Amino acid sequence: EIDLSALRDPAGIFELVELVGNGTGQVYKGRHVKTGQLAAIKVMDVTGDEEEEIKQEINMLKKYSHHRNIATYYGAFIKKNPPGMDDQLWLVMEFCGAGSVTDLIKNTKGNTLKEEWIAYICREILRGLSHLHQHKVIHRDIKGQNVLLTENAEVKLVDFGVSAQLDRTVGRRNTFIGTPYWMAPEVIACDENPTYDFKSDLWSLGITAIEMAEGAPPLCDMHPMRALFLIPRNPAPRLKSKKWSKKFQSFIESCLVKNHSQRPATEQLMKHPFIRDQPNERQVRIQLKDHIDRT
Amino acid sequence: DLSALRDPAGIFELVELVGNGTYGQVYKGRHVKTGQLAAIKVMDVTGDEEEEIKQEINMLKKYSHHRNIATYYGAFIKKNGMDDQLWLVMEFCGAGSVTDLIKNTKGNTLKEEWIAYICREILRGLSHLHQHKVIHRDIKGQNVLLTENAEVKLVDFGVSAQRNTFIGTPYWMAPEVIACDEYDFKSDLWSLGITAIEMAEGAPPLCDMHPMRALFLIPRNPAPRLKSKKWSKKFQSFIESCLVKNHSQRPATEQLMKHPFIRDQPNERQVRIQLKDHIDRTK
Numbered sequence: 001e002i003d004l005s006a007l008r009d010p011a012g013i014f015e016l017v018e019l020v021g022n023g024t025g026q027v028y029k030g031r032h033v034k035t036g037q038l039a040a041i042k043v044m045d046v047t048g049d050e051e052e053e054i055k056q057e058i059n060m061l062k063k064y065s066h067h068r069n070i071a072t073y074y075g076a077f078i079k080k081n082p083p084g085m086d087d088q089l090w091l092v093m094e095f096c097g098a099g100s101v102t103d104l105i106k107n108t109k110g111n112t113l114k115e116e117w118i119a120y121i122c123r124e125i126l127r128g129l130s131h132l133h134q135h136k137v138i139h140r141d142i143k144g145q146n147v148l149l150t151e152n153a154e155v156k157l158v159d160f161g162v163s164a165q166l167d168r169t170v171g172r173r174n175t176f177i178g179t180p181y182w183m184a185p186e187v188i189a190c191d192e193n194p195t196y197d198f199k200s201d202l203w204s205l206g207i208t209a210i211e212m213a214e215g216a217p218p219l220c221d222m223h224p225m226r227a228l229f230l231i232p233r234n235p236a237p238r239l240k241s242k243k244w245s246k247k248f249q250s251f252i253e254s255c256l257v258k259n260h261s262q263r264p265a266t267e268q269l270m271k272h273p274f275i276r277d278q279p280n281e282r283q284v285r286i287q288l289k290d291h292i293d294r295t
Numbered sequence: 296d297l298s299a300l301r302d303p304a305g306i307f308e309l310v311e312l313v314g315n316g317t318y319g320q321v322y323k324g325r326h327v328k329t330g331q332l333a334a335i336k337v338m339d340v341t342g343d344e345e346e347e348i349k350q351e352i353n354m355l356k357k358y359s360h361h362r363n364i365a366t367y368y369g370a371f372i373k374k375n376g377m378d379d380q381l382w383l384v385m386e387f388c389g390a391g392s393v394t395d396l397i398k399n400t401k402g403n404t405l406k407e408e409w410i411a412y413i414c415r416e417i418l419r420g421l422s423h424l425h426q427h428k429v430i431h432r433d434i435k436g437q438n439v440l441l442t443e444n445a446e447v448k449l450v451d452f453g454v455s456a457q458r459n460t461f462i463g464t465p466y467w468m469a470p471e472v473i474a475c476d477e478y479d480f481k482s483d484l485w486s487l488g489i490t491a492i493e494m495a496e497g498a499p500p501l502c503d504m505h506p507m508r509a510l511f512l513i514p515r516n517p518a519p520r521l522k523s524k525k526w527s528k529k530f531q532s533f534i535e536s537c538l539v540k541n542h543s544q545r546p547a548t549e550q551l552m553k554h555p556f557i558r559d560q561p562n563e564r565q566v567r568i569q570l571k572d573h574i575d576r577t578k
């Protein structure tokens with residue numbers, strides 16, 4: 001376990017620079033005092049309600065953020081406040097300068113990405129998830145908003161706030177948590193009594209590949225509740241355009257299989273030609289970096 | 296006394312910008328009358344950096360007269376809306392840094408013979424400072440320079456000591472120098488091991504990760520080693536001796552100089568010529 005009372009005040013160690021946005025708590029552009037090196041700082045208030053969730057996120061971050069496709073944990077701190085205010089805990093991690101995949105799409109003519117970039121980005125997500133799954137971890141919130149880009153267009157995964165730490169390799173879970181539009185049919189276990197696994201993350205990856213392809217996830221136009229209803233009943237989504245590759249159309253086809261038993265595992269999905277057969281990982285990264293930079 | 300320093304107007308002149316340093320720029324300079332080349336470090340005078348400016352000019356005047364340390368020629372102050380800028384004039388090291396030489400080299404690796412030669416000169420230079428109660432605190436390929444005749448010179452006394460203050464370059468920092476949560480001459484010897492790996496692999500260990508994830512990893516991870524098995528058993532041993540996370544057990548400068556990778560090294564003239572030939576081939 002972790003002891004929160006053992007965490008020091010961030011005083012002259014780190015400092016907040018500007019507010020980036022909000023999360024599951026706020027997210028700040030922060031800096032390491034002595035070095036001037038940037039970090040993202042997740043400022044969240046200490047409550048006995050969120051305590052069970054706060055503990056898991058710090059645990060997940062300390063253990064697996066070492067992999068290159070996961071935004072790395074730098075440490076945690078607790079800013080102690082007067083009797084008026086709540087104590088706020090800071091999660092310090094790798095600052096991903098370019099922002100989210102979701103933002104990149106928004107700030108792009110047509111709100112679509114070049115297939116080469118989708119293949120590059122998807123691979124990095126798959127590498128990152130393979131790390132997690134091999135370590136008996138389900139992310140449970142894979143979406144473009146949680147797939148970040150550094151200044152050098154490197155792909156990093158974020159938000160362990162809804163993650164799962166399975167015990168056995170044959171272990172299952174049945175909590176029902178995530179973002180409606182990106183949730184897997186099985187994870188919609190709000191009406192059944194029994195179970196899902198690492199496969200759930202692979203569905204969300206297919207939804208995010210569609211998000212990068214179409215600008216938004218399938219069923220974007222409906223209320224999250226309508227989507228929750230439709231996702232199980234409607235057939236597995238596909239790219240509306242015929243201009244995308246046969247490899248991409250196949251990748252989506254493999255990713256989005258409503259029956260998780262028949263849906264391919266992380267290791268086999270990594271073998272897929274859309275992921276495996278890809279050009280100079282360095283050339284695409286640079287091409288993407290060049291696109292990130294504009295107005 | 297800083298106010299006793301003359302204006303460099305007509306004495307020395309800046310020719311072109313070589314690069315940048317510790318909150319100050321470095322230019323290729325020229326003595327007006329003689330046409331002779333010098334390194335001029337141009338930095339703004341402030342009462343904040345005053346404590347740091349004073350130490351750099353002090354060490355420069357006291358220890359630069361050694362052969363492995365780029366020699367101090369003098370200081371000047373441009374009197375100026377604008378801030379007064381101080382110029383620190385030293386010997387011009389024509390061939391540039393070890394870091395640059397690596398960058399402008401196919402494979403970004405140096406011949407082991409050159410690494411042994413270069414390392415020895417750094418050790419000679421550090422032995423000088425450590426015997427004189429001085430910690431460099433910023434030993435890196437960018438601060439190890441080469442003259443036209445491929446001679447090795449040390450630079451930047453801006454973070455030096457006469458300790459625990461936490462200053463340097465993340466990758467090169469010694470575990471003990473990472474005293475960022477409330478260290479001696481040995482700290483420089485770690486950085487030398489990192490720079491030997493830099494000359495061997497093109498970059499320091501943990502280069503693939505942000506300086507922050509490196510700051511985190513350096514204490515926790517085991518001491519780095521050369522990833523290739525093609526390097527000598529002597530080189531592999533030298534790195535092994537240099538990089539000992541426990542500074543108490545890490546060998547001193549005098550004993551590290553005794554090491555066979557440094558000591559058992561041939562014609563200091565043949566290697567310097569070989570290196571000179573490589574410097575000249577690249578440009």
Ligand SMILES: Nc1ncc(Br)c2ccc(-c3ccnc(F)c3)nc12
Binds near residue numbers: 099148
């Ligand atoms: N590390 C980063 N760097 C830059 C930016 Br912009 C980030 C935005 C959001 C997040 C983030 C991290 C953890 N949990 C979340 F829900 C969001 N991280 C950022």
Ligand SMILES: [Mg+2]
Binds near residue numbers: 361362363364
């Ligand atoms: Mg000299």
